[PDB]
């Protein structure tokens, strides 16, 4: 008739998710991402770090030269990959300090071996045996020297190497424990070695042990691995008497970014940054639920296996009852399932006819805000190389359960950080998206100075007749008042 | 007379808490909870957990089997509970790694034994002394088996017992370190002895130490007590040329939930799910200021001693001033101590008589909101057993420094987390209460089109006559403006 | 003319400072604090921590009493500060447990030494070496006694030492480690040595290691150093057969807040209580980027160089687009660079003249929340003395890897707390000024009921006839409706 009707409102839809704030348990959004990574291909990706797969050799028979393991050579890794199939098949063998000699080899990143020029004299060297066969032949690992009795001696052996060059220089040797009295006699003259190996400011003393062990591949005799490192300036001296495996050369040390993980998945061509045991994964979610160990850049480790950040506004299904007249309604009391344009908008009813239109600079105003929130606080990415253990397959005591519980503290501190973000985060986006919608209805009440009135379902009757060309004005930010004043003013109140 | 005043309020109380938000260091409010547990009853509750208090036996001596622990056999446990009156009564001795021993027993949670046979051929067993009398005769520890020359002779022992079962087996030996030169032969017709006990991927070679040491129960000699894991599929040997004490059969290891703590609180009948060496506290509270040792689910410890939630709204004090015309006041004003049926409420003046009533809607949305606020972030129980010591009695140096650093890390980042969620949550509660008040106000202001007027004391002056039926409808959300509107504008405007 | 403008606003800037919340990357600001400090003088003020600059010894030379070291006798510090100019010129040496020792004594704090009465008997005492010249004579350390041969006999020796004080005893020890087998027999008679050094709870013996080492100050020979503590109500026993470097008294122990720092900052008469190894810096910042090694109360560690917190407003910068009627604008359009009195405050236009003033119940209410807001949450100071190493010269392995993991660790997750806690407060911050701006709007629109409309820039156009006196009620808040009611009513509707 002679007044018009011009209501504010927001996008409705009709499947939404359910997410969590610091104020409710769940509410519904129209819209919602996944910030938790919970699958993986299984592959392990080639590019771009450098990936040398042992098949069935370890990192520590690579290392000494066992046969199975000679493509290994002078080779170079970003990360080496050990499987669960991996044996061994030469002399049997312990290192104590395992766990210490794997992780500095790990981090170095490379096999280089350069032979060195060093004179054993009075002993018969390259001794072997048949529980290492190279070829049909008896054998030993590539990188060590067995020195026996030549004759009917074996001398006090005193030898020394200098490092002159900038680098150092790390040396592994060992020690043999023969099973009995009359084992050690036969092979070193004495009945009781010693291998001494020092530095300017080190030492190390071993006294082999014997007696007999398990057979382990027809023997019941063991070798004992030890290691030092001689840096720029300093001597290298060994001094022994008996029962010594001799170096051949060193292995030059680098500092870098190399590390070790045991895996059992297959290696495949294709790019991926982040790599578990599990396979690689992709690195665009902050956080991942796949495993705890990992290498390269790579999302948090947490305990949920969905975290839902709310990307739009909250979703009030438009009430199917459609009022006879079609009433339009506003955002007090629904949303509008009918919008595509933009997320606020303007519904109007006048004599010419009903219509609908969309509002860019809200629309634009939300969106620019809501894009790119989580990257304001948290870092896009994190890079780690080499780490700690966190998985053991014997029992050991002191050290590792101190490992295990700086694991843990590290876990339930960083998943309670996850748990709070997403609350808060979700709680700022419902506020600002409301706020924008309460900002549109005072910007449009402003500008209807006395010649609207409210109603209270969020719509303004306008006392005056609005053409398509009033109600655009008004949409626009030009309505003038003054013009349609006095007519309104006598409608209104007379 | 021919108008109305309808004014909107919330309740107040006469004693209020000081709490603590972002925003102000301390405000008043209506109500508060505690979040620390500080207190402790000082009993240790005997369910739901299996509680085994040593009485005068440390865990190490129930193992080997001192005669003063011989109730202890093949005894069970979630948590053993050692006591600061205990001691020890048998041959004296030291386990080097005792605190790994100690560590691996406790999470094991058994003293199951299985005797094995073993054939020790050529020697004389059951070995005994009066530093340990079972009895008025001499006696040993009853796992161990004190092994001597036969006639005069002392033959090389070698023995192997094999794993065929299904589970792990947990081996004690130890090794006897005589006074004086004259002992070692008297005993061991040897002058040095030798232990080795070795499986296919491991070994251990002990020599013993002669030499005066402090008398301990009129001896000057010493024990020393060591231990192998073999897991199924390996064997066990043994081979000592002297000063064996051998082992008599093996533990059973199982993987649970027990561990150790050391308290000196009475055991008492009663249920409870946390345990601290100060007695049990109960888990209601999410924090604890009593220990930072605890077992089973329990509260996270914290360094304060009070943390206030607000679970209420803001406590403006009723002025005392009272009108002397009773002039009904509102929010803006201060709040009204004469309201027990709900927080939220309408007082009516009118020609009938003054009047008050409370408003059920608005108080439900602010409870059900404040209602379980805590719960949504940090989680109801935390579950932990086994975990690093916490208190030391001696120096020790690297180790004992890093974990020192490791528990004070821990304490700091979650005493942090602590004073922040209690800030941000309590001006989360004041800010959801404020504009639920101001939420009331907006939808009786937009049902009042133009038949009342705002004073701003949190009043709205009606200008039409009001009787209780006409205030019942504003309450309600029924009230038709357009039934009054000519009477209030030719009343308000004229 | 007939009618009256007034309206309100807030202080702008011209040179403002970008900071970063939740909801905004970048917002300009009026004013904005820094909180973490980059900055050091690069030296080490004496007060109010006792600072004992070690000039070239170590603090182990200084224990043992190396001739260059003897001014540190009976010295005692709260910080150690040891020189990367230091040497040794005295009888090599090695200390397995190198780490252990150097924590044990910085922790205590004192080289208090008591000489004890210890009979050695049928030996010779104060062996010397010409590797150690104490003046033009041969010398050696001054708290440890060389032992050798009296004439062509070494007896066993066994001596004992009781605590019968109420405080902890620490005695250094050692055992001497000859290069051939001709040089064992010529000191002590026998061919293989022995030190065994025990209390009644603890025992520890070391055999000697014969062979060549590189030449230091003309010696291929090296001494091993050991250590005991023995409790208040426990003995000491030694019992040597060869070989042993005997003590010559205890060093006292005490439990307090002293440390030791590697540094080469110069010491300098200044009073500051934060120490690092780049020189001490002040504690008034939250946060710091100078470096992770420190002492006394400190800053907390973060990687971030810059966190800035506004301290201040919004800076909308005045359009200069100066009005040609010099049309009096608001807030809703920009800020008002001509107001020093206050932040807030009016401007009015009247037939007078145009005016300024400022509000001081709003600016000081805005003012008395943000002084002091991070004092709320973080602590003012957190102390800490000794801690871990954080910096390592040489390859270790496990160990090393775990304290590098555990100081990452932490750093990661203060680094997070730092960046949530500025972007949280500065939100926080913006909405309260904000909010601030609006109560004073509503406050001026309920004291003018119906003789005053809004215009939306900010501005009240009131209806009657407001002289200075008019204005000034309004401001004060003593603004009486009633009396220009019916003149506004029939100028504005009529
Ligand atoms: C101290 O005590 C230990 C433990 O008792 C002794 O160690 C044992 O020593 C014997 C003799 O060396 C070892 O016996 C050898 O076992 C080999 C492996 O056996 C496996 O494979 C065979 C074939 O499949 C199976 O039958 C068997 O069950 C195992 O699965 C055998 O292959 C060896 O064979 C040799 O002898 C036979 C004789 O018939 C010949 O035909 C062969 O050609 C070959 O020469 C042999 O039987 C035994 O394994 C050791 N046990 C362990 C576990 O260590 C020490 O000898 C003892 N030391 C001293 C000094 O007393
Ligand atoms: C190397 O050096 C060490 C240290 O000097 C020597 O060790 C000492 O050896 C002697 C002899 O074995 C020990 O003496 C014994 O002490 C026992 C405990 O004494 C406590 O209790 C008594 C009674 O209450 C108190 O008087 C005393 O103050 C202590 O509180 C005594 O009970 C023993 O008594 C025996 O001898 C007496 C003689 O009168 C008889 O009446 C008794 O029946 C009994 O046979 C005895 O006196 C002494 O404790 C050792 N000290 C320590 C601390 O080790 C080594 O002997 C020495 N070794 C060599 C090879 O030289
Ligand atoms: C086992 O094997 C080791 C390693 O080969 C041997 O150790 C070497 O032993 C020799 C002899 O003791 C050491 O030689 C000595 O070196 C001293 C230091 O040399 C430095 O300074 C000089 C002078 O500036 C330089 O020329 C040199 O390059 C070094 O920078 C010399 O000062 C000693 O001099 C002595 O002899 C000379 C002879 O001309 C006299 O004039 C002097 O007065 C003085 O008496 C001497 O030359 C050598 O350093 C050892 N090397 C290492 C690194 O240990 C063991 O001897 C050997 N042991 C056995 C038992 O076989
Ligand atoms: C493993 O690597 C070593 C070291 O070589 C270095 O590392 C490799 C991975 C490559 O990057 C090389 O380019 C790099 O130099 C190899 O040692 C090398 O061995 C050869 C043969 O012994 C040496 O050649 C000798 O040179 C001398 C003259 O100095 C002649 O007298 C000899 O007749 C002979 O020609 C070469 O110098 C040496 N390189 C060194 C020391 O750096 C090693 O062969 C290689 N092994 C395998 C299996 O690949
Ligand atoms: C400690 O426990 C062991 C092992 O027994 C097992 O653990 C217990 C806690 C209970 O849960 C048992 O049900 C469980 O089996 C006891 O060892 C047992 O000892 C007895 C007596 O030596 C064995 O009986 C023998 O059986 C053989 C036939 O196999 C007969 O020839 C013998 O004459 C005799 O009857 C029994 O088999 C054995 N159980 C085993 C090995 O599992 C042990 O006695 C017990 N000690 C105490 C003090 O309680
Ligand atoms: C290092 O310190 C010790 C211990 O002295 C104590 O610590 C000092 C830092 C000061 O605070 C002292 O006040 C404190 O006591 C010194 O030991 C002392 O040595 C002297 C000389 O040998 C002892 O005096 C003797 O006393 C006896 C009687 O008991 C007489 O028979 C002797 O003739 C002689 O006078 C004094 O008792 C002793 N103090 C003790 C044991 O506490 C030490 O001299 C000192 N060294 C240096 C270089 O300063
Ligand atoms: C990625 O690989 C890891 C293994 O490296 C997978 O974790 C493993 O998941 C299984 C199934 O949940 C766990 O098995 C269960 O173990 C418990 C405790 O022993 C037992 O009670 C159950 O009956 C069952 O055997 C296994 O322990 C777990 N391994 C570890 C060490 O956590 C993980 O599921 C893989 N993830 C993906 C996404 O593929
Ligand atoms: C629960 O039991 C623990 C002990 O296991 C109690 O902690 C102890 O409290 C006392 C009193 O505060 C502390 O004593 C003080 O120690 C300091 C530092 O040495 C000293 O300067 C004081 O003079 C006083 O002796 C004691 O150290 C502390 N023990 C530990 C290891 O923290 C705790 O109070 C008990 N709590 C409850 C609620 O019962
Ligand atoms: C306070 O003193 C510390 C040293 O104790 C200073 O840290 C050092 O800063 C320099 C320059 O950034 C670092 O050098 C660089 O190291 C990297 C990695 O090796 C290398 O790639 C570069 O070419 C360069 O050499 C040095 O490593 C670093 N030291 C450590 C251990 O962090 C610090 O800058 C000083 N701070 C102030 C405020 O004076
Ligand atoms: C909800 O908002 C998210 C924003 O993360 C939209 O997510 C994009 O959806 C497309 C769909 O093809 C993906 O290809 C993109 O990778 C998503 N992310 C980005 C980077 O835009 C999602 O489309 C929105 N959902 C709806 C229904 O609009
Ligand atoms: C303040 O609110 C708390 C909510 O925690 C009320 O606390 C309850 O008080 C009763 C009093 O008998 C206890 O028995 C309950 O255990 C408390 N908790 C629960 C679970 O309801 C407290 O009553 C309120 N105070 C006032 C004055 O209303
Ligand atoms: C911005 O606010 C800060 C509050 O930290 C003011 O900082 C003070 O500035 C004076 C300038 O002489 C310093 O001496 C003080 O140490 C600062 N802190 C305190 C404790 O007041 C700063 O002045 C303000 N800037 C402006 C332009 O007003
Ligand atoms: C208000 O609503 C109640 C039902 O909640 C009803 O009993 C009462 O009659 C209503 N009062 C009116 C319409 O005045
Ligand atoms: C406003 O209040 C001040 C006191 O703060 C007073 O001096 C002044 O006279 C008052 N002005 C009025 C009522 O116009």
């Known amino acids: 008739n002679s007044t018009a009707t011009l209501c504010l409102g927001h996008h409705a839809v009709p499947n939404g998710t359910l997410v969590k704030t610091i ?15 919970s699958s993986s291909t299984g592959k392990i990706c080639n590019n ?52 210490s000699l794997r992780s500095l080899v790990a981090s170095s990143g490379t096999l280089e071996f350069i032979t060195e020029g060093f004179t054993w004299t009075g002993v018969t060297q390259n001794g072997g045996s048949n529980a290492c066969k190279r070829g049909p032949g008896s054998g030993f690992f590539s990188r060590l ?42 092979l070193y003259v004495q009945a009781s070695g010693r291998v001494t190996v020092s530095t300017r400011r080190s030492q190390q003393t071993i006294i082999p042990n014997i007696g007999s062990r398990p057979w382990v591949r027809g ?35 680098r500092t870098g970014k190399s590390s070790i993980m045991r895996s059992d998945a297959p290696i495949d061509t294709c790019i991926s940054e982040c790599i578990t045991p599990n396979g690689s994964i992709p690195n665009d979610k902050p956080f991942q639920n796949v495993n705890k160990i990992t290498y390269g850049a790579c999302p948090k480790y947490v305990k949920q296996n969905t975290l839902k950040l709310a990307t739009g506004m909250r979703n009030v299904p438009e009430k199917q009852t459609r009022g006879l007249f079609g009433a339009i309604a506003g955002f007090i009391e629904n949303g509008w399932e009918g ?30 805000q809501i894009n790119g929130k989580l990257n304001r606080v948290i870092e896009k990415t994190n890079e780690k190389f080499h780490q700690i253990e966190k998985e053991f397959s ?28 997403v609350a808060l985060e979700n709680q700022h986006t419902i506020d600002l998206t409301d706020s924008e919608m309460n900002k549109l209805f005072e910007k449009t009440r402003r500008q209807l100075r006395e010649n609207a009135e409210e109603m209270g379902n969020g719509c303004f009757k306008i006392y005056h007749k609005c053409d398509n060309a009033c109600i655009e004005s008004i949409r626009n930010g030009t309505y003038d008042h003054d013009v349609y004043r006095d007519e309104a003013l006598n409608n209104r109140f007379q």
Chains 1, 2, 3 share one sequence.
């Open 23 to 37: 104020t409710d348990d769940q509410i519904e959004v129209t819209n919602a991402t996944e910030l938790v990574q």
């Open 48 to 99: 771009p770090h450098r990936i040398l797969d042992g098949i069935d050799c370890t990192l520590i028979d690579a290392l000494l030269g066992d046969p199975h393991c000679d493509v290994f050579q002078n080779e170079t890794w970003d990360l080496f990959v050990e499987r669960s199939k991996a044996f061994s098949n030469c002399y049997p063998y312990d290192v104590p300090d395992y766990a």
């Open 145 to 186: 020297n067995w020195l026996t009795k030549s004759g009917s001696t074996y001398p006090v052996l005193n030898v020394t190497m200098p490092n002159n060059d900038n680098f150092d220089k790390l040396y592994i040797w060992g020690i043999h424990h023969p099973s009995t009295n009359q084992e050690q006699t036969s």
């Open 219 to 253: 023997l019941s005799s063991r070798i004992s691995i030890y290691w030092t490192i001689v840096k720029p300036g300093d001597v290298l001296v060994i001094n022994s008497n008996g029962n010594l495996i001799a170096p051949r050369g060193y292995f030059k040390m």
């Open 339 to 368: 919008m595509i344009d933009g997320w606020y908008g303007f519904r109007h009813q006048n004599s010419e006819g009903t219509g609908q239109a969309a509002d860019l600079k809200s629309t634009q105003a939300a969106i620019d």
């Open 394 to 421: 014997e029992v050991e005591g002191r050290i590792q359960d101190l490992e295990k519980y700086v694991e843990d503290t590290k876990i339930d501190l960083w998943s309670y950080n996850a748990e709070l973000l």
